């Protein structure tokens, strides 16, 4: 419970969330219409998929 240890725990949590988000999950039930993503593409959080 010491202040120093919890600081590092927060960073561990942020890194873990970063790693768990390498798998992109669908937020809605539906059907796929356009597909502009191919294996090997370089993706940022601004590129439609």
């Amino acid at each position: 419970d010491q202040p120093a240890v919890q600081q590092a725990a927060t960073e561990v949590r942020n890194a873990w969330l970063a790693l768990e988000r390498t798998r992109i999950i669908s937020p809605m039930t539906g059907y796929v219409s356009r597909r502009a993503v191919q294996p090997g593409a370089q993706i940022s959080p601004t590129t439609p998929l």
Binding site: R34, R35, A36, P48
Partner: protein
């Protein structure tokens, strides 16, 4: 003359392009010269054939009235067809311009390279689509006109030969 008018309009139909020079729209009229040359004199000679000299005035008046009516009708139909088919082609074209499309974000990138805003680039793309639609719609009208000519051919044979 009817066959020559069909030839000229089909000529225009399959040869109009965005980057066509002055000569691309000057040869077809050189050809249409023959078609126009051999259409007025013969048909007007047939129209006023055998009538007495005194009535030539009234016949001429009737002929001119009908011809002017036909001209007005043609203009009225053609202009509306041109604009409406331009709208249809615009609708069918603007579909391709969406995200999820290479060679569509590249255009935006090149446009923003020149300093245009996003809205200005969108307007420019829309204008280009409009121009292409006008050319396509304009060429669709020429094709229809030539086809219609092909049918009007044979009617002239119903006139008896009292010419003189």
């Amino acid at each position: 003359s009817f066959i020559m008018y069909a030839v000229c309009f089909y000529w225009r139909a399959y040869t109009f392009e965005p980057g066509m020079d002055f000569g691309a729209s000057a040869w077809p009229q050189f050809i249409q010269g023959f078609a126009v040359a051999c259409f007025f004199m013969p048909l007007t000679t047939i129209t006023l054939s055998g009538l007495p000299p005194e009535r030539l005035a009234a016949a001429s008046s009737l002929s001119n009235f009908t011809r002017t009516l036909a001209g007005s009708i043609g203009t009225s139909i053609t202009t509306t067809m041109w604009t409406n088919r331009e709208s249809m082609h615009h609708a069918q074209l603007t579909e391709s311009v969406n995200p999820f499309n290479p060679n569509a974000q590249a255009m935006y990138s090149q446009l923003e390279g020149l300093g245009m805003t996003q809205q200005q680039a969108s307007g420019w793309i829309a204008q280009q689509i409009t121009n292409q639609g006008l050319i396509i719609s304009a060429n669709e009208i020429f094709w229809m006109s030539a086809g219609i000519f092909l049918v009007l051919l044979g009617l002239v044979w119903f006139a008896k030969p009292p010419f003189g």
